[PDB]
């Protein structure tokens, strides 16, 4: 099992750490957060308002964060080039702070001793991957890669199935997204994105998302054929993608249900899900799928113009894919 | 000023009454609700969690509901044919209970003495109207009409402008809607629509809506060219329409903005609004427009496939249109 | 052997009692009656839960029965409780969860169908009330119709018992900051009897009257007339908190209050009364089966005789598990 | 003769004090200092408000100034308060609303720029604290730096004053069910000092410590050491409620408590202390400029000496209007 280091014990960093222990696919050996001390890290990992108390043991012992008897080395560095990743035995580093997404900034970890870096966010220049869509294009020469956004990971598996079977001429997407840590409880300041500063509890907030554009950077045939926007709404977790698209070949709705059902049962098992149940957002809380096609929620205007709905736990689905990507990277070593 | 009777003092009935006094276009002279007594009606009209305390005076006096010194006759009938609408001087009756939407059911009010009935909801058989779109097709022979739904009243004015200028080849709509009185606080029973029974506070609930299909009945050229679905989200009021459509003529996004701005300043003034501000849902609370085009929120894939965003106060916007429709009917009398 | 139980009403309490029965395995649900929810809808409502998640097990409709974990349950669709053939389905006890038959005369209708005992999963004006860990030992086989009090009394009474037994409660006033309930409205709607309860649940803090503190007196007779309170309904889907401000007879340092509560949670009230010193919030008690959990860090003392004691409760799980525990206790006395 | 005021910080308090100044017209805002919010963003933040709606007038950027209702306001972008040219803009008083300069030494920096008096819109460790209607008459012209206490202190103190003056408060314990604040997090985030305050604001009832009941003893010296309490943050955007459980020296029937509160709201505490017998909920006090409104129907008495008194407050508009009223009072004493 590959030994992993996690930079940042924020919402992504903690959920990637929890996915690592829950799945057991990788071994967390080090965590770096210059602001959260060891005692606070135990509290933040143990208790979760959204996903509940950690099913396992969490304790501070000899200056280390012990999760299920596994001692994890804690670092408090502000500069990523100063983290002694190699000393703690961290082969891979999950860059989850969101402030080092370019290969230049993400490359500071390689100076500490890390061999590979996985950016748990979209990157402007690093190669992007989505498990089940283009992870086979990963090779050992790639020292710094990105796992795209949770929305890019929800849309791309559905886009792959729909394009492979009927061909997406063009598509426009909307994601009705749950509130995130970047939003404000009451009307506050967000100098760059004014709407994002408005009260998260009281508002439907339109937001810009490069996730539908990013899908074309992972399914190169769809490059320039997809774009979209988001609406942040007052729910703590679980989001939904709404893809309105035009198809090349005609597609009856029940043929597109059969097509997604096959992919969910075969190659995209655990990545792409399929349901015909009368589901609502809370039904996908702690669901580890990247995306789950909602058959009953979608609607077709004609054989070439459809609206396809797909749910995703923006927190769990994505953190599990970061772990799956590293497990795949380790197998190619 | 025409004298109006309101059947049902529910959320629509109270807000239509409020719009009548706020705008002064109509005179409410009678209200019928077999369940809410006069004292409770004073409380429900005066205090509103969403729109605040009524700006004016409300009292119970001599068995009459007195709003701004205007005495309103109160009836407690379960059978709509037994309401003495004519005795109270009610020329038009707003049928807001939602349980008498067919012309046969809504026609019962004419037995009590009413001359015309306006169903404040979609009807299976009554002629439908949307102010600013097809209200000129109303004529004095029509004794029972429908004002369509609040979502139709938001989509149809935008669809009218977009189709008149560029031609809508086909369109698919999503409405991210605020919670309604038909939803449940916690997981409860809704035998017909299972998803609508699930906890309103905790969930994004997909729902079916014939509002996009209904635009084809007020704009006969778009018949069969539009359909959609809804997502109910945890906000008390203000909803948004997201129209993804293909245009016949090419349309740069600034040309779409230009023609919408012109319609909002000219013929659809007060019905269709236009904004370039960094708005969120709460900015449209108590906004009486039927729909307000959000220029900054929309996105174009090319010059033939666009996503157009438009806000609507699902409560005040529609209620004011019920009053405007009656103010129109009176002018044709 | 395990008591066979019938559940009247498949509403929020009825489903969670049925859930607690299978999760704990203390009793066997053999029949359910709801005249409005059909068998197919019952499968959906039991399987999926927004608050507590999908049911850990299997649930399916098969041959007109609701099979949960391979156990077939007989479904009835009766509006009149006297017309339910409880005895035919083998139901020895009936949980009256509809909330509309809380008097002994109304709840007694279930005995006409063949039931032997009726447990009202709500407060009753006349039936004997019980709170597990406080006065369940006063239950005897002569009692054919009993009440399990409310969720709020089942939270307050175990804390009141410990505090009164050790220091004596001279007088107390409590406030419960409660989660939204099925009786509330999504937007400003009509609630003819309780006008405030009709106002939008999402937008408001709604003051409400509750006889739960008064009901503690009917379970700890020494505190009769010594306790009263009110509630504030707030916009959270589940988990509530009790705030008891009281005057004590004997002096009590806050660490002595903590010490005696910790002892009771580890000994006789294990699983009923909990104790924590952690930096907890409401979501930390979601699906917690305790009747009440004393929050040591949240409470505050003015002086040795005047304190504010905070205690959390999953108003949904804590209570339904106590309905199951009460019937398991009744079965042991048979 | 409107006193010309400067506002340091265009955060929620700063904007709401500016809004109260124009809505009430009691003082003239002439300058605003915020080193992070530029003029164009200030127009947006003042014009649109999720809680209180769009401003009742006009807001625009013109010639590098913020013009509200035709009144041009000078904008400063200084990080050091001592470097703000308050005197050049004509600002006689400065409202210190950033929350980071609450000591008299820190708040005194504004006097170096040319200000004559500084009003801290928050509690201060050392500055004299005032609550309008309870101790504002103790303000005198020697006081160049004062504090307006907190929003909860301004709610509790006027009710405590009436109750103590008529019946005498032997001892009291207060709980405030408070709306969410800017210091909370949307989802589980870090708050190193107060761990519970970092947990998701939308999902939780969060117990919190508050020195607001203790602080009432400063403005009402007769209640020093006689009051303490805690808070519960709940998922509502605005409007909070105080719950005072207290023991009275003199017996008081609940109708006598109502009678004396109604008299104070109609007489000396008109506009500060309100009184209602209506079936009110929190949203009914949104944009209500009262410091506290006694809810007659929500409170409950156990006996003539032990009561729970409920009082609502718009934690935003109540307090902001008191900052403006306090400065209008200071100007009258000049």
Author numbering:
A (entry chain H), B (entry chain E): 3 to 335
C (entry chain A), D (entry chain C): 2 to 335
What are the paper's exact sentences on this?
The GAPDH-catalysed forward reaction occurs at an important transition point in glycolysis between the enzymatic steps that consume and generate ATP. A fraction of the molecules shows Cys-S-sulfonic acid instead of Cys in the active site. GAPDH allostery is mediated by intra-dimer contacts (the active site of one dimer subunit is in close proximity to residues in the neighbouring subunit).
HsGAPDH crystal structures carrying a Cysteine-S-sulfonic acid modification of the catalytic cysteine Cys152. HsGAPDH in crystal form C. The GAPDH monomer is in surface representation and coloured blue to red from N- to C-terminus.
